[PDB]
Amino acid sequence: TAAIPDEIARQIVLPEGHKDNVPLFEAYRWLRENQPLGQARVEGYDPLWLITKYADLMEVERQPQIFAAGGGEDKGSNNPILANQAGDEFTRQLLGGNLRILDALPYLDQPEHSVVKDVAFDWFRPANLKKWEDRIRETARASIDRLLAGGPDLDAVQEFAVFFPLRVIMSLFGVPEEDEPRMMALTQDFFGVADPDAQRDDIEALSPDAAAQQWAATIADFYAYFDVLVESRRAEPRDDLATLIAVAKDENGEYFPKTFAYGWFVAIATAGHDTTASTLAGCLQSLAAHPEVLDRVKGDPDLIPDLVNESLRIVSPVKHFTRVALQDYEMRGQKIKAGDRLMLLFQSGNRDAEVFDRPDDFDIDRRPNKHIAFGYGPHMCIGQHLAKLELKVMLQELLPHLERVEVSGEPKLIQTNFVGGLRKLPVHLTFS
Template sequence: MSTTEQSTELIPETIARQIVLPEGHRDNDALFAAYAWLRDHNPLGRAVVDGYDPLWLVTKYADIMEIERQPEIFTSAGGEYKGSVNPILANQAGDAFTKSINNGSLRILETLTYLDPPEHTAIKDIALDWFRPQNLAKWETVIRDIARASVARLLATDGKVDFVKDFALQYPLHVIMSLFGVPESDEPRMMALTQEFFGSADPDAARADVAPLSPDAAAQQWVATIQDFYAYFEALLQDRRANPREDLATVIAMGRDPNGEFYPNEMYYGYFIAIATAGHDTTSSTLAGGMLELGRDPEQLARVRGDLSLVPHLVNESLRWASPVKHFMRTATQEYTLRGREVHAGDRFMLLYQSGNRDAEANPNPDSFDPQRRPNKHIAFGYGPHMCIGQHLAKLELRIMFEELLPHIESLTATGNTKFIQTNFVGGLKNMPVSIEFRR
């Protein structure tokens, strides 16, 4: 590669830092401006940021799709790359810490994120049928009862609430824990661990047992939180093996490998962690993001409130808009030409789902929140074999909540500054102070 080619691929440092660094994600306006600049000027560019390995930033919908559908070329962390690359971006100090306490491996969790087919397929299949729409339909009454109770508690307030902390966080947490089989009394513990897990780079979610501001602090918190999850889920695993129930925890605990044997316990812990974290955090971020935009456009709010058949489209638009899963990493296993640029085995790619969902080539007028958008080509759940196993449950939860909530909302007005979680991985609104006028 010539020096000229390298220079045209290189992303300006300010843009690269805005996207790569967790602190760049506190300012949503600046973050999406950086995404837009890249889509317009350098849609597949090389980012060089101090403290991080060089990587490609993938900002266009089509390029993300091309990578996602070819796990044999762009691995999550499988095959010869098992344990040597991280499917979640961490800085060099963080990866070094993980290797130091994990026998030289970055595969700190035995979960779908770190796997590729066929291993990925076999483990995903353990719970795949449970997450199919025809099975989830039998849980709709349970979910709707939870939604109605949540709305009733909101209606009992004066309408001056933090929509994230007082409402959006609680509903999907209670849903997934109820279906999963975690006692309601343990839900606060699951919420705290989730916030520590996804907020490992956010000072507001820092653990007391992790030294703040050290280069590997985020990785230390990640590992410490995983260990706490393991301690909790060991008891859950053993209980479901001894006392099977009609819940998701039992389905996973009873899952076996293709030879009919149980997997190592760490695989079950990893599965449980994925359900207990992404199973609610992403849904609450989407709910809050969608309601904030409806509140900003009273005509759209009135239109959807008056025609609840639009709610499924509102759900998809909220997912596109919020895109709470911000990235996953992929590693090239061979030479490949992507968007006219030659990439090499070992090159790493940060798939920027938020940017892909604002790509005008996939979704015209992408910076307008349109609850009637059809078609809606969002990739909030990823694509290909790594497409989110819980997507149908998330959509069901969101549809039910919007159906139950919107008929009671005359208006929703932001009353203070909203803040976003400091993370480049999974997250959304941290707070959302609002004043709600209810329809009585």
């Protein structure tokens, strides 16, 4: 019934606690074993129930009428992405009393969430992504040719893994190649709001609300760019994802307000490539640690989807979203009160020993691989089938060219409690 111990709560809640995966995953493990559903009360944050168990993540996510993303009828009364209190106070000054800074899926509750998701639902289904496989494969091949020409010594992240998923999503989206560097810079600003190596020059870096200022500044740069793209596709439609979203109309034949298109476009321009790059880099890191796995998948390319699934489980680069209890609710002997916020810890769910035998082991032979790296419930990752296709296609093209991966310098993680993974993986490759 007590609060979570401060040292454990701080390790998970504070962005600084994610700088090193070792103490972070030991804090998740301490909770799952000792206090699987407790309230973290960290100075400068709202109290948060830390949802550490696989079964609890599904129980919460499958009941959106109880556990809201955006606050329910009081729209924008909950921030789905954990800011500190000072940050949420900054946002309420910016927006005038609420926290809905984007009109994007994570901020929405049903039935609004369903109406908006219906715009892109079919586009993201596996059968509808098949039309892109050959173009993704040509992109993967172009990226691997540059890797082979560049020699065996590189940062597998900033000199390889980042470019492929960015080129794929910008090509599908319909953004020209020359705009990719600025999209990459803004994605770094967006997911780097609390990382001292990713600070924007235009906001206060050390203010209590610094991360919320960076988030808003980054969004404003996206809105400027996307407003031009929305008016462009409304005036002259193309066969691209920018058009599908730009021209989308409601049941009354009115365009959705432009901010809905901007919200899609922000999610696509950031989430649409960064986590794909992280998972690919974490895959290479695991192949360095488990060379027998690389030998096996080179011997049987049909194992590549299993390798992708186990990489998603181990890397789990999307660490949380938040929810708010719309009513009192009992779970695992604890009384969650109406108004209480919850932090869904997907990386912890993915190490739950009740679900996964030897959960810290890299084992591609888990079948089925029950991972929750894409979440659950109506907010389950809409991009997951695009991500899995890109990772499958890259590893089908790449792994024949790799005899060995060696990590030849210190890996670096993005310092974030939100969307993380490797920003640096110095390697020495042996080409086949």
